[PDB]
């Protein structure tokens, strides 16, 4: 999107990419499971925007302690994707007890 | 609760004593147990080899961690060394929790 003179113009950049990696080693602060927003909507007809990743560390008020860690996400092997490329990923759950859906 | 590894079958107790060596008994039979013994004690060496399994740190953190270090400042005597009289002393209690990891 190039905003020039009040008139907005949105053109596709075929050579631009996006990086997408999956932390399979759990080396980054796990944020899911805190019941945050930004889920695939429930209704399939609508489009959603992807939430921003941010993490927390130890603190002493608004300050950082010695053990406070800084994780650079650019320090992981991402996978650049142009239009035309796709990202596939598989995962198999460990053995967890059935959820008792009965009274 | 004092720390360590709880074991159901811990290293057994190695018990050791000096076998009694009676002093010269009477020349006439006395049913009473001999209470006179040759004074002795034993010495010798003992080795104990233990193999420990480690779990190497794979931190993908960006900034430096907190290592245990001997403070660089000059002292009268080195820490964890013998003093001028040959008396070895451990100046402080060292724990293990230095490296950090996410929760």
Q: Do B61 and A69 touch (CB under 8 A)?
A: yes
Q: Can you read off the two tokens belonging to residue B66? A: 């907190």
Q: How close A4 gets to chain B, by Cα (Å)?
A: 39
Give the three-class secondary structure for B58. Answer: coil
Q: Do A66 and B66 touch (CB under 8 A)?
A: yes
Per the listing, tokens 């740190």 go with B57
Q: Do B62 and A28 touch (CB under 8 A)?
A: no
Q: How was it solved?
A: cryo-EM
Contacting residues of B for A25, CB less than 8 Å apart: 58, 60
User: A71: how many CB neighbours lie within 10 A of its CB?
Assistant: 19
Closest Cβ opposite residue A70 in set B58, B62, B66: B62
A30 contacts B102 by C-beta, under 8 angstroms: yes
Phi-psi region of B72 (alpha: psi -120 to 50; beta: other; left: phi over 0): alpha
Q: How far is CA B95 from the centre of its chain?
A: 16
A67 contacts B66 by C-beta, under 8 angstroms: yes
Please list, in sequence order, all residues whose beta carbon lies within 8 angstroms of the beta carbon of residue A55, skipping any fewer than 6 positions away.
Answer: A28, A29, A31, A71
B102 contacts A28 by C-beta, under 8 angstroms: yes
Whether chain A has a CB inside 8 Å of the CB on B63: the answer is yes
Closest Cβ opposite residue B100 in set A27, A69, A75: A69
A31 contacts A53 by C-beta, under 8 angstroms: yes
A23 contacts A76 by C-beta, under 8 angstroms: yes
B60 contacts A76 by C-beta, under 8 angstroms: yes
* Concatenated DSSP letters of A7-60: EEE----TT--------SS--SPP-TTS--S-PPPSSTT----PPPP------B
Q: How close A56 gets to chain B, by Cα (Å)?
A: 10
Long-range contacts (CB closer than 8 Å, 24 or more residues apart) made by A61-68: A66/B66, A67/B66, A67/B100
Provide Rg for chain A, Cα atoms: 20
Q: How far apart are CA B93 and CA B89, in angstroms?
A: 11
CA geometry: angle B7, B10, B11, nearest 5 deg: 155
Residue from A22, A14, A35, A30 nearest A84 by CA: A14
- To one decimal, the resolution in angstroms is 2.8
Phi, psi of A9 (to 5 degrees): -125, 125
Closest Cβ opposite residue A67 in set B58, B62, B66: B66
Q: How far apart are CA B44 and CA B18, in angstroms?
A: 12
Contacting residues of A for B63, CB less than 8 Å apart: 69-70
A36 contacts A27 by C-beta, under 8 angstroms: no
Q: Is the dihedral of CA A82, A86, A92, A96 positive or negative?
A: positive
Whether chain A has a CB inside 8 Å of the CB on B56: the answer is no
């Amino acid at each position: 999107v190039t905003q020039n003179e009040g008139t907005k113009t949105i053109a596709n950049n075929l050579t631009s990419t996006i990086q997408v990696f999956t932390d399979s080693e759990y080396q980054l602060p796990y944020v899911l499971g805190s019941a945050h927003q930004g889920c695939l909507p429930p209704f399939p007809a609508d489009v959603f925007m992807i939430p921003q990743y941010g993490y927390l560390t130890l603190n002493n008020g608004s300050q950082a302690v010695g053990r406070s860690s800084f994780y650079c996400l650019e320090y992981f092997p991402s996978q650049m994707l142009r239009t035309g490329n796709n990202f596939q990923f598989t995962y198999t759950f460990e053995d967890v007890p059935f959820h008792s859906s009965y009274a | 609760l004092m720390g360590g590894f709880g074991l159901k079958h811990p290293p057994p107790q190695i018990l050791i004593k000096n076998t009694p060596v009676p002093a010269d008994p009477p020349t006439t039979f006395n049913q009473s147990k001999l209470n006179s013994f040759i004074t002795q004690y034993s010495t010798g060496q003992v080795s104990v080899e233990i193999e420990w399994e480690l779990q190497k740190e794979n931190s993908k953190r960006w900034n430096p961690e907190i290592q245990y270090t001997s403070n660089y400042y000059k002292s009268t005597s080195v820490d964890f060394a013998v003093n001028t009289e040959g008396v070895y002393s451990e100046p402080r209690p060292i724990g293990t929790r230095y490296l950090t990891r996410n929760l």
